[PDB]
């Protein structure tokens, strides 16, 4: 099953209390960018050594309680440090100011590289800690099995797979630090339906 599950449709939650000094949502709320922001840059003469840069989290606007759900996104290749995965409401309150009984999961992206958190319970063959960043990354959350899988959509290949606690509501979760960007992707099937609509509604005579 190419997308292993039904495509889960959502947008970035403008109301989750994200840090809007450092994170900017685009007009559709389907892209988030990390920025230094005005307060830092207007005070930049004071910075000669460095600065404590917060990791700024944001979640999707729609929760998962049950079932199998898939979604995909593009991380900007230049991104300093980005995390992507899932998080329960409990964990979110910390971030927003055995594996199976851990209620979140994140992989780290940066420098156009995908970082595999760990490989336990799989001695088969030495696996890379660093992979090239896929132009498009997929997540499959299976609440029945309590598993989350991360996919390189360029190669159609699972990169990482982990037990996760689904006893409570889970949200698509993201975090950005330094400059970076994440764009939520729509399946090509959505594009072909958009085209039908544009031709049906918006094709006039001269």
Author numbering: 506 to 602, 627 to 735
Copy text from the publication.
TRIM family members typically contain a RING domain usually catalyzing ubiquitin transfer; one or two B-box domains mediating protein–protein interactions; and a large coiled-coil domain region, which is involved in self-association or oligomerization with other TRIM E3-ligase proteins. All characterized family members shared the same overall PRYSPRY twisted β-sandwich fold consisting of a 7-stranded and a 6-stranded antiparallel β-sheet.
The crystal lattice of the TRIM36 PRYSPRY domain contained four molecules in the asymmetric unit, forming two essentially identical symmetrical dimers. This observation is consistent with the TRIM36 domain eluting in gel filtration with a Superdex-75 column at a retention time corresponding to a dimer. The dimer interface is formed by a helix-turn-strand insertion between the canonical β-strands 2 and 3 of the PRY subdomain. An unusually large insertion was observed between the canonical β-strands 5 and 6, featuring an additional helix and a long disordered segment. Another noteworthy feature of the TRIM36 structure is a unique helical extension at the C-terminus. A systematic analysis of this canonical substrate-binding region in the PRYSPRY structures determined in this study revealed significant variations and distinct surface properties across different family members, providing intriguing insights into the divergent evolution of TRIM family members. In this case, dimerization via the insertion between the canonical β-strands 2 and 3 effectively occluded much of the putative substrate-binding site.
